[PDB]
Amino acid sequence: KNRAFLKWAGGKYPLLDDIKRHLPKGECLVEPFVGAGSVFLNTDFSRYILADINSDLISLYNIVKMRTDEYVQAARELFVPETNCAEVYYQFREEFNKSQDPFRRAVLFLYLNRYGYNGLCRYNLRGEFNVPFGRYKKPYFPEAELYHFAEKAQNAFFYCESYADSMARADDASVVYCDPPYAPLNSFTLEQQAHLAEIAEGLVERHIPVLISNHDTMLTREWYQRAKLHVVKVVDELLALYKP
Amino acid sequence: KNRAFLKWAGGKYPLLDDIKRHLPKGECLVEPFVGAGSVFLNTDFSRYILADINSDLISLYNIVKMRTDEYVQAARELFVPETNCAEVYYQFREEFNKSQDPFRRAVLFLYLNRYGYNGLCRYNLRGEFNVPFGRYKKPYFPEAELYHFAEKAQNAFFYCESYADSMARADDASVVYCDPPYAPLNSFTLEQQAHLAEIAEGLVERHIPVLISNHDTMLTREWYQRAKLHVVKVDELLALYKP
Amino acid sequence: KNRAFLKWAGGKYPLLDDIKRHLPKGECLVEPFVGAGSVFLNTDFSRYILADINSDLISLYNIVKMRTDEYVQAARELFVPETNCAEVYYQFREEFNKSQDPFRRAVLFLYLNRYGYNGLCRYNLRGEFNVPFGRYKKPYFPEAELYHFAEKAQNAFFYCESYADSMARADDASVVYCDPPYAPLSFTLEQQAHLAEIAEGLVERHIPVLISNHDTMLTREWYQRAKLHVVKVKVDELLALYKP
Ligand SMILES: CN(CC[C@H](N)C(=O)O)C[C@H]1O[C@@H](n2cnc3c(N)ncnc32)[C@H](O)[C@@H]1O
Ligand SMILES: CN(CC[C@H](N)C(=O)O)C[C@H]1O[C@@H](n2cnc3c(N)ncnc32)[C@H](O)[C@@H]1O
Ligand SMILES: CN(CC[C@H](N)C(=O)O)C[C@H]1O[C@@H](n2cnc3c(N)ncnc32)[C@H](O)[C@@H]1O
């Protein structure tokens, strides 16, 4: 099983065999909530459309795609022992928030994902990255994963847009896999979670298959009430397949 | 231990022995929060006054009481294996939310109770029953529990009304048992919780016993401060107001 | 290992010996958040400034300090068996709340601390003490602890004031230890950060400060300028040292 190069919520990698079991076949996979990319990295579609609201994520993904060697080399420079302390961390963090250069931002952003508190990505109310120092003994530099993702990206487009716009991009030869922010047990709202179910109903009507993952709850069985449902044990996870 | 025909919060236990331990005796038992009826169903009062704000519940209970055979036969028809899929569950939910016939609604409510998600009874902001499909393997049809409920109901009146109104029907021959929506750890408010203790203080003074159960917390010991308290094992509390 | 005479939040002290391991040396210890006094009672500074916002607390401590004997004597009389029931608990609670005598208030207040639900100290919106009856088998009367506190109090001043005013009383010869109300898993986030800023200003002036809290994304954010130490205990506890 190939690993994502970012520490990122979801694609904590079980449920892969289960997603790949119910994931239908096609020329193209659309992921409106790509995140770490672990579905992308462990399937073999001939092409990919991959999207996410987080503009730092997509921008880094676009750099890894088009400037592979230059990127890896600059970013390796920051995984040295001299950088594993707070004095350097808060220094690199301040540079990230002050910079207008996407390439330097994207080198920094991988440093912050691996040297920061629980690998979180968060922002205060002014748009600044505000995750504090993570106090790790030995952060891994993910060389192999970086190369694997770049190779695999040669068959992908990355967009920074909302789930509605990227699902509109799908067509007759597409399959859609949605991994929205989890239902409860400004962020992603209930209106939006139900909205995501609607678009799917629209897509299957046109013979585009859609698969959605999420917790198993009263609200999730309500919203996906017209998919074929599949509970997977582990609290429980729910897979909803809209199969023409 | 006679089982209730409905699933209903709790469930499903009511620590009945501990309740019956402290529950005084009289001619008539008043429950302002009847719910599933565990206590009604497992005691021997000469008679009962039974009440709840949920009007779907009370209407059902009057129908089981007055039209037993008619009801059991119409409800049994929804328990056939042909109705055990999503397509049918959502249709029946819609039929129930659109019906204005009490009998038909009472018949569909049993189905929704037994085929819906975790046995919940919930409504959206438009008043529609909104529990989704439970996907159960093989729902039990509570035929014996139905008939026991009906037989026992012969000595019982049912009222859809709030706890202050049902509690005013008690007299010197009654006992009152209170199972309100739980204290914390249009829902039932803190002001209503305290209000219930105070209606209880005024009852016990008119020589009418009241027993209340709840979680054991800072707010419940404060509200029940003038009753004898017994802690049972989160912890349960039973506040007894004895003359 | 000397105990506090009050049951009180964080008076449960599974640290030390971690606080003392990390607490610097000096003539005077300032506590802005003394509470029940554990650090005070288990250290050997030549003098102390001890402060808290709760005025029932500070008034009590002034009384135990300055009227040790009449106090111990009057309090002892409430710790009998006829007082360990609700009819009496609520009677004394109403007395405390109605009273304007500080001496009798201080006497009722220890009764309420030991006979009351979970040793809580809480007021309602009218400012009346509102903890209910705690139903304990037999509450212990903290005689020896009272004298130990009184005797140690001879080297102490007590002020009823906010962390900002107490921390201003520290000088060259002082050390400051802050035990604030816990960060979340009423004291505000804005105050939580203000505290760390005053500490920063103290260390600039060569006055050490040690702070204690839960280990969280926020506490690491606020205390980002201290040397930090993590104590396993069950969520982790953080200690933050601002050393010259
Ligand atoms: C992480 N993905 C979910 C994983 C997992 N189910 C969880 O909740 O932990 C969500 C991805 O959705 C992205 N996202 C959030 N809102 C939107 C949106 N409105 N449109 C597209 N992507 C979004 C987040 O950045 C995130 O990368
Ligand atoms: C189920 N009973 C409580 C069981 C349990 N202690 C729990 O909290 O889950 C509560 C019952 O009280 C009813 N109820 C809620 N509010 C009122 C009210 N204001 N007056 C009368 N009954 C009420 C509910 O329909 C419910 O049937
Ligand atoms: C109990 N103390 C220690 C905290 C402990 N870590 C806990 O959260 O359980 C906090 C003390 O600080 C006091 N306190 C609350 N606010 C302030 C303030 N603004 N200034 C000084 N003391 C305060 C409380 O009365 C309390 O006694």
mmCIF file of N, CA and C in Angstrom, chain A residues 216-219 221-222 225-226 228-231, chain B residues 86 90 93 117 120 122 130-135:
data_model
loop_
_atom_site.group_PDB
_atom_site.id
_atom_site.type_symbol
_atom_site.label_atom_id
_atom_site.label_comp_id
_atom_site.label_asym_id
_atom_site.label_seq_id
_atom_site.Cartn_x
_atom_site.Cartn_y
_atom_site.Cartn_z
ATOM 1 N N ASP A 216 -21.318 6.298 10.402
ATOM 2 C CA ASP A 216 -22.667 5.689 10.299
ATOM 3 C C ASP A 216 -23.486 6.308 11.416
ATOM 4 N N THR A 217 -24.496 7.101 11.067
ATOM 5 C CA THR A 217 -25.222 7.901 12.054
ATOM 6 C C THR A 217 -26.621 8.106 11.515
ATOM 7 N N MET A 218 -27.468 8.657 12.356
ATOM 8 C CA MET A 218 -28.804 8.926 11.941
ATOM 9 C C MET A 218 -28.810 9.904 10.737
ATOM 10 N N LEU A 219 -27.947 10.923 10.770
ATOM 11 C CA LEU A 219 -27.959 11.916 9.697
ATOM 12 C C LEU A 219 -27.388 11.345 8.405
ATOM 13 N N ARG A 221 -27.514 8.140 7.315
ATOM 14 C CA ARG A 221 -28.476 7.246 6.654
ATOM 15 C C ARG A 221 -29.645 8.016 6.083
ATOM 16 N N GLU A 222 -30.026 9.101 6.756
ATOM 17 C CA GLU A 222 -30.976 10.036 6.149
ATOM 18 C C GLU A 222 -30.471 10.594 4.806
ATOM 19 N N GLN A 225 -30.095 7.987 1.778
ATOM 20 C CA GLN A 225 -31.127 6.989 1.901
ATOM 21 C C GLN A 225 -31.438 6.274 0.586
ATOM 22 N N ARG A 226 -30.876 6.770 -0.495
ATOM 23 C CA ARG A 226 -31.203 6.178 -1.737
ATOM 24 C C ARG A 226 -29.986 5.627 -2.467
ATOM 25 N N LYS A 228 -27.157 2.430 -2.273
ATOM 26 C CA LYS A 228 -27.086 1.136 -1.625
ATOM 27 C C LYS A 228 -26.090 1.319 -0.471
ATOM 28 N N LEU A 229 -26.455 0.920 0.729
ATOM 29 C CA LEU A 229 -25.634 1.186 1.890
ATOM 30 C C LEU A 229 -24.735 0.029 2.385
ATOM 31 N N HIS A 230 -23.568 0.338 2.947
ATOM 32 C CA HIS A 230 -22.645 -0.728 3.363
ATOM 33 C C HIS A 230 -21.940 -0.305 4.624
ATOM 34 N N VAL A 231 -22.237 -0.928 5.762
ATOM 35 C CA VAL A 231 -21.581 -0.616 7.027
ATOM 36 C C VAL A 231 -20.284 -1.394 7.112
ATOM 37 N N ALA B 86 -35.622 -0.524 2.430
ATOM 38 C CA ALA B 86 -35.670 0.942 2.377
ATOM 39 C C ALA B 86 -36.810 1.487 1.569
ATOM 40 N N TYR B 90 -39.298 4.249 3.762
ATOM 41 C CA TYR B 90 -39.547 5.645 3.323
ATOM 42 C C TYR B 90 -40.970 5.882 2.799
ATOM 43 N N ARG B 93 -43.091 5.949 6.012
ATOM 44 C CA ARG B 93 -42.833 7.188 6.731
ATOM 45 C C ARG B 93 -43.607 8.385 6.098
ATOM 46 N N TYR B 117 -34.230 3.368 12.662
ATOM 47 C CA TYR B 117 -32.908 3.464 13.292
ATOM 48 C C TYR B 117 -32.893 3.531 14.811
ATOM 49 N N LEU B 120 -35.530 4.997 17.770
ATOM 50 C CA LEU B 120 -35.759 6.400 18.107
ATOM 51 C C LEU B 120 -37.163 6.900 17.693
ATOM 52 N N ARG B 122 -38.223 10.681 16.681
ATOM 53 C CA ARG B 122 -37.756 12.060 16.491
ATOM 54 C C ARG B 122 -38.506 12.781 15.383
ATOM 55 N N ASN B 130 -38.963 11.845 11.454
ATOM 56 C CA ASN B 130 -37.791 11.885 10.617
ATOM 57 C C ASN B 130 -36.673 10.846 10.920
ATOM 58 N N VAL B 131 -36.978 9.755 11.632
ATOM 59 C CA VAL B 131 -36.003 8.676 11.845
ATOM 60 C C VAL B 131 -35.739 7.902 10.552
ATOM 61 N N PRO B 132 -34.472 7.686 10.180
ATOM 62 C CA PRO B 132 -34.232 6.896 8.931
ATOM 63 C C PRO B 132 -34.385 5.321 9.124
ATOM 64 N N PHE B 133 -34.083 4.540 8.082
ATOM 65 C CA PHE B 133 -34.156 3.073 8.082
ATOM 66 C C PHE B 133 -33.126 2.392 8.973
ATOM 67 N N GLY B 134 -33.608 1.493 9.842
ATOM 68 C CA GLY B 134 -32.743 0.839 10.806
ATOM 69 C C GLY B 134 -31.970 -0.304 10.201
ATOM 70 N N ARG B 135 -32.325 -0.728 8.990
ATOM 71 C CA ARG B 135 -31.805 -2.023 8.416
ATOM 72 C C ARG B 135 -31.717 -3.245 9.390
#
